C-alpha cells in the first residue's frame, strides 16, 4: 500500500512549523528552467494525479503508520498528526489542493510555467509543498518525451533529405530500454513517454500504463516484431551460426524478423552467411516481411557503414529519386548498440555522406533513451512564488547571488499566447490585467478529483513535429 | 496487477521458437563485466525475487491477458500459451527456475559470476531468459550501492587524514534524491541501496522497502533531522530572511537543524546574519543540536571554501591534533548541490589543501547518487553460458570480433576463493573438480520459493570497508 504521508522528502515533515505564523496560502509552480533542448513536451502529470493523488489518500491507518515511522526516523516527535487528521475528518481524506496545468503533449519553450499548485483550505498551507517531491518526478516523463522528440526531429530531417518523404518515421527509433532502467515502474513511465513520439517498443510495461491512465482508439499504442537475441544464436554452438540463422528466418518466414548477427563475426555473417549461404532465403521474402540484420558491437557509425557496404555488394541496391542508395525491400538494418541522441546524429550524418538512404535503417535505444537522463537536463524545478500571511498576499522568490540561472518567478502565474502566437508566462498576477488574453493553464486537479484529462491520441497530436503538421 | 507474462522485452516472447530443437536446459549468468569501480556490492536480488518471482505468478487470467496484448502488439499470434499453461497446470503457477547467488552485501571484483539462472523442468528451457529483463534490473541497486560505497571510501580517506578517526563517517553522505529519480519504485530501491553504506536519508521510500524485504534489528535503517527549504525562508519576504532564520532555529532549538542560506546572498547570510545578527542563537546551541548551514548554489568547491572562510572568522575555530581547522561543535555545513562522486572528491581535496577538517562538512547528493547512473557503468549483463541439447551439454558464449570486452563466459560457472583470498570464477564446470574449495553461490530461489534470505544487518556487515574492519 502506497502512503502519501511517507512519500515526501523527510525534511518536509518539519516545514509546517517553519512558515510565517498565520500563513493561509502557499502557491507554487513547476517549470523547466531556462539556462540544447529549447522546448519541452509536457507529459506525465496525469499518471501521477491518478495513481497517487486522487481520492481518499489519507486513512487513520496511514496516519498511524507515518507517525510511527517518523518517530524513529527523526528520533523525536515532529510529525503533523493534527494536520493530516484534519484532512481525514474534514475532506474524507481527499487533498484540498488545486492544480492547474498546460495540456499534456503540449510543446512549450523553456522557462514557462507548466503547472501550479495551491491549497484550497487555509489550514492546509503546508500541503502545497508536501507534495513537491511526488509532483517533481514528472521531470522524468517530460524529459524522456522531450529527448525522444528531439531524436525524431533529427530522424525526420535526414529521412526527408535522403528519401523525400517521412514514411515510416514513427518506427525509426525503437525502445530497447526495459532491462536498462532502474525499476518496473520507471520502465512503464519512460516507455509511455517514448510512445508519445514513436510507435515501436519492446518495453511492454508501457502499454498497460497508457491503457490504464490515458487510453487510445487503437488496441495498443506500440508494436514490435519477432527477433533473435544472442542466446538463441549462440545456443546452437559456435560452428552452427548458419543453422541458427536458417532456423530462425524459416520459423518467421512471413513476418518481419530481426536477427542479431555479431555473435562471432558480424562482417562474416553479413558477407558469407546472409550474403551467400542463406541468400536464397532472404531474396525470396516479402516487402512486408523483411529480414532486419542487427549489428551490436564496434564503433556504431563505422560498423553501420561497413555492414551497408557489405550488403550493398551482395544484394541488389537501387538508387532512389533523391540519389541515395537503397537496399532491396526484403532487407533492412537496425543499430541497437550505443545509440543516444548524439550517436544517432553521427550515424545518420555519416550515412548521408556515404549516400545511403535513412530508409535503410532503424535504431534501437535502451539506456540512452530511458535511463541516461537527469532532472538537470531541462532543469525541472518546483518553487513557491506566492503566499498569503495575515490576509496579505506576498510575491516570493529565490535569487541566489552566485547563480542567476536559479532565480525563480514571482507571484501568481499564468500562461498566455503573445501577439506573434508564442508562449509567455506572466508573473505577479499580471494575467489579471487581461492584456494577454486568457490563461492557457487548465484546472486538472481540485480537492481530490481529477478535473481534466487527455487521451493518448490527443497527447500524440499535441506533440507532433511542425514538419509532420506541414504534411 | 503485475503480470510476469508482460514483464519481459517483447522479442523474448518469440524466443521459444528459436532455440535449437531438443533443448532441455538453458543456463545463464549475471556479471558486472570487466572492461575504477574495480569491485561491486551485490545487492537487490532479494527484492526482485520476493516482489516479482515467487509464488503463484501465473494464472488463467494472466495468460489470457498476455495472449490478448501480444496479438495486437505483434499483429500476429506468436505467444507461447502452451508453455505458460504447462507451468500453471503442473506447478500451480510457480516458476520452475533455480537461481544461485553470491550473498548480498558481498563485495566482488568485476568480471565474476554474481548469480546464475537455469530451468528445472526440460519443458521450460525458454523460461530462463524470459526473466532476463526483470533480473537484469538488479543492475540498479548494485550500481547505487557500489557508487555510494566508492564515495564512502573517499570520505573515509579524507576524514582519517584530517581528523585521525572515522567518527560520523556513516552520516557524511545524505540521500537527497527522492525528487530527482524517475519513479516512486526507483526511489525506494535506490534509497535502500545507499543505506547499505550510510545511515542518512530523506528518501523515506527506502525505509519501507528495507522493512518489508530485508529487515533490521533497529526500528529504522535510516535517519534525518529537521531542515528548512527555500520556500520556508522565502515565504517570509526578501526583507525578512533574518526573521525566518530566527524563527526556524528557535523552533528547533534542541535538535540539529539545517538551514538553507543562499536564497538571496549566501555570503551575507553567513557573515552578517548568522555571523552577527543571530550569532547569539548559534553559540548557545548544544553539541548534540548544531546549526548546519547549507549553501546551495555557485561552484561547489569555491562556495564551500568561502563559507568556511567566512564562518572561521566569525566563530571560534580550533586546530585539531592533525593540524586541521575545526568549527565549534554547534556549527557545521552541508553541501547538497551538484554533488556526485567526482565533485565530492574535488571538494574534500580542496578542503584538505586549505587545512579544513572533513569533520566540518557533510554532503547531500540527489541525482548524482540515485539517478545519474546507467547499466554501462559496471557493465551489468546477463548471458547464456550452457545449454543441453539432445542430452548433451554444450558450453556457449558470444565473442564479437570488433569488441573483446563483450566476450562472455563459457559453460557451467562457480565462484570461489583463491589461495590468496581473492575471488575467481571457474568456467566449463571446472568447479566440479573441487580444486578451489566451496562454491560461494548459494541457491536463493527454486521452483517459486525463496530458499535463502539475508537481513539488512548482514548485508551492511558484508559491505563494510576494509578501513572500517
Ligand atoms: O530486436 C529487438 N526487438 C524487435 C525489433 C526488431 C527490429 C525493429 S525495427 O525497428 O527494425 C522495425 C522492423 C519492422 N519494420 C517494418 C517492416 C515492414 O512491415 C512493417 C514493420 C519497421 C522497423 C523493431 C523491433 N530487440 C529488443 C531489444 C531490447 C534490448 N536489447 C536488445 C534488443 C533487440
Ligand atoms: O536538509 C535536508 N534534509 C535534512 C538533513 C540536513 C542535514 C543533514 S547532515 O547530513 O548534515 C547530518 C546533520 C546531523 N548531524 C549530527 C551529527 C551528530 O551530532 C548531532 C548532529 C549528522 C549529519 C542530514 C539531513 N534536505 C533534504 C533535501 C532533499 C532535496 N533537496 C534538498 C534537501 C535538503
Swiss-Prot record, chain B:
<dbReference type="GO" id="GO:0005125">
    <property type="term" value="F:cytokine activity"/>
</dbReference>
<dbReference type="GO" id="GO:0008284">
    <property type="term" value="P:positive regulation of cell population proliferation"/>
</dbReference>
<dbReference type="GO" id="GO:0006954">
    <property type="term" value="P:inflammatory response"/>
</dbReference>
<keyword id="KW-0539">Nucleus</keyword>
<dbReference type="GO" id="GO:0042802">
    <property type="term" value="F:identical protein binding"/>
</dbReference>
<dbReference type="GO" id="GO:0030054">
    <property type="term" value="C:cell junction"/>
</dbReference>
<feature type="binding site">
    <location>
        <position position="375"/>
    </location>
    <ligand>
        <name>beta-nicotinamide D-ribonucleotide</name>
    </ligand>
</feature>
<dbReference type="GO" id="GO:0045944">
    <property type="term" value="P:positive regulation of transcription by RNA polymerase II"/>
</dbReference>
<feature type="binding site">
    <location>
        <position position="179"/>
    </location>
    <ligand>
        <name>diphosphate</name>
    </ligand>
</feature>
<comment type="similarity">
    <text>Belongs to the NAPRTase family.</text>
</comment>
<keyword id="KW-0007">Acetylation</keyword>
<dbReference type="Pfam" id="PF04095">
    <property type="entry name" value="NAPRTase"/>
</dbReference>
<dbReference type="GO" id="GO:0005829">
    <property type="term" value="C:cytosol"/>
</dbReference>
<comment type="subunit">
    <text>Homodimer.</text>
</comment>
<feature type="binding site">
    <location>
        <begin position="336"/>
        <end position="337"/>
    </location>
    <ligand>
        <name>beta-nicotinamide D-ribonucleotide</name>
    </ligand>
</feature>
<comment type="function">
    <text>Catalyzes the condensation of nicotinamide with 5-phosphoribosyl-1-pyrophosphate to yield nicotinamide mononucleotide, an intermediate in the biosynthesis of NAD. It is the rate limiting component in the mammalian NAD biosynthesis pathway. The secreted form behaves both as a cytokine with immunomodulating properties and an adipokine with anti-diabetic properties, it has no enzymatic activity, partly because of lack of activation by ATP, which has a low level in extracellular space and plasma. Plays a role in the modulation of circadian clock function.</text>
</comment>
<keyword id="KW-0963">Cytoplasm</keyword>
<keyword id="KW-0808">Transferase</keyword>
<feature type="modified residue" description="Phosphoserine">
    <location>
        <position position="455"/>
    </location>
</feature>
<feature type="binding site">
    <location>
        <position position="230"/>
    </location>
    <ligand>
        <name>diphosphate</name>
    </ligand>
</feature>
<dbReference type="GO" id="GO:0043123">
    <property type="term" value="P:positive regulation of canonical NF-kappaB signal transduction"/>
</dbReference>
<dbReference type="InterPro" id="IPR041529">
    <property type="entry name" value="DUF5598"/>
</dbReference>
<keyword id="KW-0202">Cytokine</keyword>
<dbReference type="GO" id="GO:0009435">
    <property type="term" value="P:NAD biosynthetic process"/>
</dbReference>
<feature type="binding site">
    <location>
        <position position="294"/>
    </location>
    <ligand>
        <name>diphosphate</name>
    </ligand>
</feature>
<feature type="modified residue" description="Phosphotyrosine">
    <location>
        <position position="171"/>
    </location>
</feature>
<dbReference type="Pfam" id="PF18127">
    <property type="entry name" value="NAMPT_N"/>
</dbReference>
<protein>
    <recommendedName>
        <fullName>Nicotinamide phosphoribosyltransferase</fullName>
        <ecNumber>2.4.2.12</ecNumber>
    </recommendedName>
</protein>
<dbReference type="GO" id="GO:0016607">
    <property type="term" value="C:nuclear speck"/>
</dbReference>
<dbReference type="GO" id="GO:0007165">
    <property type="term" value="P:signal transduction"/>
</dbReference>
<dbReference type="GO" id="GO:0007267">
    <property type="term" value="P:cell-cell signaling"/>
</dbReference>
<comment type="pathway">
    <text>Cofactor biosynthesis; NAD(+) biosynthesis; nicotinamide D-ribonucleotide from 5-phospho-alpha-D-ribose 1-diphosphate and nicotinamide: step 1/1.</text>
</comment>
<keyword id="KW-0090">Biological rhythms</keyword>
<dbReference type="GO" id="GO:0070062">
    <property type="term" value="C:extracellular exosome"/>
</dbReference>
<keyword id="KW-0328">Glycosyltransferase</keyword>
<dbReference type="GO" id="GO:0047280">
    <property type="term" value="F:nicotinamide phosphoribosyltransferase activity"/>
</dbReference>
<dbReference type="GO" id="GO:0032922">
    <property type="term" value="P:circadian regulation of gene expression"/>
</dbReference>
<feature type="binding site">
    <location>
        <position position="202"/>
    </location>
    <ligand>
        <name>beta-nicotinamide D-ribonucleotide</name>
    </ligand>
</feature>
<keyword id="KW-0662">Pyridine nucleotide biosynthesis</keyword>
<dbReference type="InterPro" id="IPR013785">
    <property type="entry name" value="Aldolase_TIM"/>
</dbReference>
<dbReference type="InterPro" id="IPR016471">
    <property type="entry name" value="Nicotinamide_PRibTrfase"/>
</dbReference>
<keyword id="KW-0964">Secreted</keyword>
Amino acid at each position: 500500500e502506497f502512503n502519501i504521508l511517507l512519500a515526501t522528502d523527510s525534511y518536509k515533515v518539519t516545514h509546517y512549523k517553519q512558515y510565517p505564523p498565520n500563513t493561509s496560502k502557499v502557491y507554487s509552480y513547476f517549470e523547466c528552467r531556462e539556462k540544447k533542448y529549447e522546448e519541452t513536451v509536457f507529459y506525465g502529470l496525469q499518471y501521477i494525479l491518478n495513481k497517487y493523488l486522487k481520492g481518499k489518500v489519507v486513512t487513520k491507518e496511514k496516519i498511524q503508520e507515518a507517525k510511527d515511522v517518523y518517530k524513529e526516523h527523526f528520533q523525536d516527535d515532529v510529525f503533523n498528526e493534527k494536520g493530516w487528521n484534519y484532512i481525514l475528518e474534514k475532506y474524507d481524506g481527499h487533498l484540498p489542493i488545486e492544480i492547474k496545468a498546460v495540456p499534456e503533449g503540449f510543446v512549450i519553450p523553456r522557462g514557462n510555467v507548466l503547472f501550479t499548485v495551491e491549497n484550497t483550505d487555509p489550514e492546509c498551507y503546508w500541503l502545497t509543498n508536501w507534495i513537491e517531491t511526488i509532483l517533481v518526478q514528472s521531470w522524468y516523463p517530460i524529459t524522456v518525451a522531450t529527448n525522444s522528440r528531439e531524436q525524431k526531429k533529427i530522424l525526420a530531417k535526414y529521412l526527408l533529405e535522403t528519401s523525400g518523404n517521412l514514411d515510416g518515421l514513427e518506427y525509426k527509433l525503437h525502445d530497447f530500454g526495459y532491462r536498462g532502467v532502474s525499476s518496473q515502474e520507471t520502465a512503464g513511465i519512460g516507455a509511455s513517454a517514448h510512445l508519445v513520439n514513436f510507435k515501436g517498443t519492446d518495453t511492454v510495461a508501457g502499454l498497460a500504463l497508457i491503457k490504464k491512465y490515458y487510453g487510445t482508439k487503437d488496441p495498443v499504442p506500440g508494436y514490435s516484431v519477432p527477433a533473435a537475441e544472442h542466446s538463441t544464436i549462440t545456443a546452437w554452438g559456435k560452428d552452427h551460426e548458419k543453422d541458427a540463422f536458417e532456423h530462425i528466418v524459416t520459423q518467421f518466414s512471413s513476418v518481419p524478423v530481426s536477427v542479431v548477427s555479431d555473435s562471432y563475426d558480424i562482417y562474416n555473417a553479413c558477407e558469407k552467411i546472409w550474403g551467400e549461404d542463406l541468400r536464397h532465403l532472404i531474396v525470396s521474402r516479402s516487402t512486408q516481411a523483411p529480414l532486419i540484420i542487427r549489428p551490436d558491437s564496434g564503433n556504431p557509425l563505422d560498423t553501420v557503414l561497413k555492414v551497408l557496404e557489405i550488403l550493398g555488394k551482395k544484394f541488389p541496391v537501387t538508387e532512389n529519386s533523391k540519389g541515395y542508395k537503397l537496399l532491396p525491400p526484403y532487407l533492412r538494418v537496425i543499430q541497437g548498440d550505443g545509440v543516444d541522441i548524439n550517436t544517432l546524429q553521427e550515424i545518420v550524418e555519416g550515412m548521408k555522406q556515404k549516400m545511403w538512404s535513412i530508409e535503410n535503417i532503424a535504431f534501437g535505444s535502451g539506456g540512452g533513451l530511458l535511463q541516461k537522463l537527469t532532472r538537470d537536463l531541462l532543469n525541472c524545478s518546483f518553487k513557491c512564488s506566492y503566499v498569503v500571511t495575515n490576509g496579505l498576499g506576498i510575491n516570493v522568490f529565490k535569487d541566489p547571488v552566485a547563480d542567476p540561472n536559479k532565480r525563480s518567478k514571482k507571484g501568481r502565474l499564468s500562461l498566455h499566447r503573445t501577439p506573434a502566437g508564442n508562449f509567455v508566462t506572466l508573473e505577479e498576477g499580471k494575467g489579471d490585467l487581461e492584456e494577454y488574453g486568457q490563461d492557457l493553464l487548465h484546472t486538472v486537479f481540485k480537492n481530490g478529483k481529477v478535473t481534466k484529462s487527455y487521451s493518448f491520441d490527443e497527447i500524440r497530436k499535441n506533440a507532433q513535429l511542425n514538419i509532420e503538421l506541414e504534411a
